[PDB]
Symmetry: D2
Subunit: 334 residues, 4 copies
Amino acid sequence: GKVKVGVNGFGRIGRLVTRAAFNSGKVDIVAINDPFIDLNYMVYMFQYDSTHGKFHGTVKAENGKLVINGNPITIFQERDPSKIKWGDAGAEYVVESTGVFTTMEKAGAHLQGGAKRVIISAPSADAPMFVMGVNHEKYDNSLKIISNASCTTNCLAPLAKVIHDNFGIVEGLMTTVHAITATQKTVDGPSGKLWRDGRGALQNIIPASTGAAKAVGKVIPELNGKLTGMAFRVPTANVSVVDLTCRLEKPAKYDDIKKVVKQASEGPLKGILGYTEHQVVSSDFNSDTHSSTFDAGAGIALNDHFVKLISWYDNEFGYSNRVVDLMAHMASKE
Amino acid sequence: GKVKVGVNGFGRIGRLVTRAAFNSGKVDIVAINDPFIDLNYMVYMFQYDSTHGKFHGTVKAENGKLVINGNPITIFQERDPSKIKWGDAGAEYVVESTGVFTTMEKAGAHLQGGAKRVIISAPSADAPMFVMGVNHEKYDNSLKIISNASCTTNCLAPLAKVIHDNFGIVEGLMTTVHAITATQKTVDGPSGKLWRDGRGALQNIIPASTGAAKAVGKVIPELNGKLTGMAFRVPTANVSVVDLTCRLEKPAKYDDIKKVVKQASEGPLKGILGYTEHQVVSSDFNSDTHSSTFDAGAGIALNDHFVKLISWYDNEFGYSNRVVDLMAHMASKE
Amino acid sequence: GKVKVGVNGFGRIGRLVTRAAFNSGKVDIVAINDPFIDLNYMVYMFQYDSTHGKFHGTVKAENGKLVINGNPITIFQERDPSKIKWGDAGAEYVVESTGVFTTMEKAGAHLQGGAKRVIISAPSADAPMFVMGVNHEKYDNSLKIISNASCTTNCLAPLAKVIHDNFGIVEGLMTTVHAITATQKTVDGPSGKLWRDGRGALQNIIPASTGAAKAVGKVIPELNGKLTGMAFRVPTANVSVVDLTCRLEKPAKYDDIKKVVKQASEGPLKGILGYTEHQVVSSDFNSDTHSSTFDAGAGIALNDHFVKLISWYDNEFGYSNRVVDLMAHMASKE
Amino acid sequence: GKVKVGVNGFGRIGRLVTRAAFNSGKVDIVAINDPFIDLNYMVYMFQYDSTHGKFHGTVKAENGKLVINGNPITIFQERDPSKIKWGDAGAEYVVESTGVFTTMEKAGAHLQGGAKRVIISAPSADAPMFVMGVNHEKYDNSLKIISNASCTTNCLAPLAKVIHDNFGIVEGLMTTVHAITATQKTVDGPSGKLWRDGRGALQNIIPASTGAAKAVGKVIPELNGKLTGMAFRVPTANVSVVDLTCRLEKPAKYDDIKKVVKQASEGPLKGILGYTEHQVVSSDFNSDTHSSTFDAGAGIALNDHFVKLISWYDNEFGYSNRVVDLMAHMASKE
């Protein structure tokens, strides 16, 4: 009864989503589209990974199809999304991960090819946004084009939801120390709009602006206009962290915050929000599937109404697993 | 009329202080003490630097003395500070930079050797603390043992002073993204008290606790009990940054904050607090002598009473130059 | 019938040897000695690893013993090796991994405590050296104190043995690009004898001298006086590589070399010497248990008598697994 | 009497060539062409540099011209090289640094715009190659399109020339440990032909093939067919090194090699080939203008006919300075 999924784009997010789908088994990948990557290169790129290690399984090419663990996958090389024959391959859901089709009008071209629903693995200007464990109960089958927001938003939303439900956030500012991404450059090089983003990634911290904190207001309507922040890009492979400073409506000692966060991570947000009291560092969360992990020992509170909270997140694996979970929930809602 | 200065310890801070003194010419180094470094090794370590490049000048050993730019320097190899003959070498002021003699009782052993005053280049539990441009006018000749605080405190204090004087800080929390230091380790290794500090510096962000924000209260009495924060250690050579989130008593748009900071950096805090509107990154502040540089474009404000401000600082060169400036002011006060 | 093993020192090599022993099951660890690491710190250090990830299993402290996968381990904190009661704990073989007891006289102190045989996990000036798959058949029960050489030697020896047996090496020079180790320093710092080794590991290549190529002559007597080389230390976590340039006695096209290396890696040196024709990079060999992997595509030959060969090796996991294998062979020889 | 020079492309090589020309004063830049970089971005990119620091001077835009140290520079934005009006701007020599016009036919389009001679700052398949201090005396005014080879070739050629002239190289194999370049990628990403080059630059060593050693045969005809090698790309900012293993015709102890290299570096190859006996590392050669620096202490010799030599080179500054020197010599030859 597992839904059939097609993936548009074999970049980092697409490859990691395919890996998560094959590791968990919640969905079945049946088609992939990439106009610039051939079959043998696809096999090479899927087999080896610098950050997450060698794939645990078998991958090979046979009769022009990518075979992963014995399951053949159809390969397309179309540049126009409306010309991809998703229906012929049997793909019911399509994951749009290229990062250039984010509006509803642009992302709706996949429906012309026979797909039933489209999931955008990035922030969208007009498509509805859903975060697993926060507002995923709001989804309905009436929706064909939705969005899974972003990694930073997926890390910030559950902790913010717990804190707001228990103590009433009045206003907060967020800072995230983020690992390097594919949009950056090894050495000083041209960068059209963001001049800072063109500087050498290995030698600098390159501050940056982000909209995840604002998008939390879209995910949680009561927090609209009460959050915002920025980011710093450090020369680290993948693991990233979130730092939230907020003012609370009700008094809250740090012990009470720890207790409520642990209780939330146990029952309701199990597998989404983690909790740890150990002396962890960034590399301890490599290949971790949690959306966010609360670091009890790293935070600090000035008084009962002004605190700073720290949460870790693997911006590669966690987001891909969340995408797979959202697709599984959508299939169950059918 | 320049004062004669002796340096205890030839570590990073001691070498950088010697470099700053010879580059600026405000003071004259006449003696150095290090029990574990010989003369030729001293020449090698002073001549070459991975972060700040080759020394611009001449350094060599002659008749058992270190000769820098033609000035001979006496070399000691004593382990007990009370046995160093500072007075015989002619040293009037002594810079204690080993990091293990920080209390007044421990640091006062240098006075037995003939030194007149002692400056501790690190936070002290009981010695008075001074920050140039903030409270250095409070110093008096009655003081023999004082402290120059720390780099992070030197970065945070001037900006906090300007903001408090103009808008009345009510409470703030600080986060600093800090470059790696000598106390860290290349690969996972033992670390007695701070378990996180023993993890590999090249692979992790290793969160950490700090007291610079609290020490700002000591430097600025009106801010006592209103500041605190923590730090993240990233795999960068030297340049570091400060991120301050605070609530203001009076309304303040971001333009007004920019105007007041620029005005302060022009007249009163010239050479101590910088100001820039360019798209800078961390490497742009290598070998910069400012205590802190305000990054106008990187900050963000939620509303008129809740803002986040960003300031850069070279934690190696700026602190050394501040130490030299403090010694020059002390000599002028004689 | 598995032999009981005690480990002296809980550094990188000791921890990795314990991990390899518990992962493979060839031997049983029953005792560990470290005077500077307590029990809880031992649990923390064994549980988490920046390079090889979290330990797959359970580790905890109970009644003053380290319990790994349900097996209790006695803990000692002696500084004098002759005072360690190895016999009381039941340890028959002892692994000396501290790096400071490498001579036969120094390493023989463990025999006074009740140990039967001692294995030095480092090069020794006078103890016999053995490399698995090269000369491990030379060992006899008459030996109580032996040596497993070093990682670089373990990588170079099998390939050199195959090449010499098939084509007759006349003379060769080796260069190894090595990852950073615990003896290096994060920032420019003092280093007694090796001045280059004290420079910042994150910013430089720091050339270095090594004796592994010469030690290959000890392991393979026919190659005595025909090999030597040096090393470069690059800012990488662990994976390292070997580059061997040699002149051959008999003509040998590159295809013949590839064929003989593949044949050797299949039958006789299975699990010790690997072979690959893929476009691999350094991270593809993380946690690989091979002593050396021949990179067919990376090498180059000037003519039929002058070639350059490339081999990869994980200098952490491979050496530890080789130590465990040597101990297992010694136990079987009893 | 200084020649007027135009630069095609404002990438790394073009910007560094402009910097070298303005620092040395041997030539005068009067025009620059880049279709994708505007004037203000050009000012920003020239002013700030992560590797070599802030430009020592003044740069600004005025009346649509780039003004450096008071000298206005014409700016073009043409994509077709034949449409650039080099003659109108007064450019007599043109530096082709885009890396895509390397053949004589492609590079000759600049002559249609009014340029007199074209210098290709990269290896060329059919244009004559010149290396300063090796064969630059072979140039004649009859040549309009020539080549300056490459950085690695410029490092290897002078040392090889000295060694061949003094001892008669019979055959040699070269390995270079190279810093990261703009063609690499921060995270695992697509790379059309070179699959290894698409892997993450910050996490791997990524072996690679090169033709500099073969090109040395073109520069030095007597060494044709006697040299070749490969490269390793390490995660370092810029400084790179060369490692040459060769067999000598005549006996040569290491002391004799050191003596001849020092003598060559003093008189004939002054400013091109350096010599050092200190314990240097890679960062000690940042912004060094030498083509190659011989590291006496790092090399090793197996016997009197088989040696390994080490030479350092800044692959950014040295090559740019060599390009400027070649243009100055060409102008003098007029």
